[PDB]
Amino acid sequence: NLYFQGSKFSAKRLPSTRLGTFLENRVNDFLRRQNHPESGEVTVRVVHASDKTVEVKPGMKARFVDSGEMAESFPYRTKALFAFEEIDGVDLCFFGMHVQEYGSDCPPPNQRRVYISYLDSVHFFRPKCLRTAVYHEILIGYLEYVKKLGYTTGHIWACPPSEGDDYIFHCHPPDQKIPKPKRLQEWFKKMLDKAVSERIVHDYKDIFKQATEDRLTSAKELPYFEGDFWPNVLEESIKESSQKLYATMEKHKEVFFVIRLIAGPAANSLPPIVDPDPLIPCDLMDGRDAFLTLARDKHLEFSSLRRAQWSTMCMLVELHTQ
């Protein structure tokens, strides 16, 4: 075999991580209990991990940071992970997700939280009848894994991409339907209800219920995440001027899930979060832009199985080499 088409550049030979091994073990265990003949071995790899900070934007800084009520910035670790399936000997990249992990050495209100910035997929998983179930196993495992390290809360924003935009994979298949907000909200509910039944998630609530239950009064109590809706909405509210906050939360409450992983009394005694995986510098996978940019420029579409496999191979070579 030619050098770049050799096994050295396969998904499997990408460096292993504790998180990657955990997710894939869980996915392949679910797959072996199904005993479906056309399914292939799944590989999950964390391909980027780096320390970042999210600084509070000027309006909120003015109101809350200079007055001493709120830290000016929050440290977090961003991770990029991808799921691959071998389809009769060929690696296919079918799912990806970037997350933001705010640890125990982080000020409130962001302490011990994970945020799913971006998630995306391409619908060639074989067999197609286990596709949704596998996406759910990955998400559930992610939540279980971070619970076990000592993250207490998770945060999901269910916004589908506007028509024609791609979140991670350049050029989806034209026959891959994009769900409307309702269908996506239900999809997340189904996943979370399964996580709840496994006693991974204690419970979840939309942001309006949660705020009510928390008797939240100030905007400084909201988690402040990189690239999220809510920091832009507050800069919008400040530049032009609790009545307007709750009103805005109620309005978008279906779209934002607060996921409680560790509950009440247990969440105060927690030891410090120790992440046993290393940092993994990889500029290609530092947020979603770099990979969209490369794939646009080099014409690496994910728009058919065969384009997706070529695109996957180029992706892999690049991760192995940078």
Ligand SMILES: CC(C)(COP(=O)(O)OP(=O)(O)OC[C@H]1O[C@@H](n2cnc3c(N)ncnc32)[C@H](O)[C@@H]1OP(=O)(O)O)[C@@H](O)C(=O)NCCC(=O)NCCS
């Ligand atoms: C989120 C995502 C992984 C869900 O994939 P999934 O498990 O296949 O579930 P979907 O809701 O997309 O599809 C399930 C079914 O609903 C159908 N469906 C999806 N959108 C539809 C629409 N607008 N109208 C009718 N049917 C639709 C699909 O065709 C599919 O039918 P099938 O099961 O018979 O094949 C995928 O839709 C996706 O990658 N979306 C873009 C990324 C994203 O939305 N991220 C948001 C959070 S950051």
Ligand SMILES: Cc1[nH]c2ccccc2c1-c1ncc(C(F)(F)F)cc1Cl
């Ligand atoms: C800011 C933000 N960004 C999000 C992104 C995804 C999911 C949830 C949130 C939230 C949120 N989290 C907690 C509360 C609450 F607990 F205070 F109610 C309120 C809010 Cl709006």
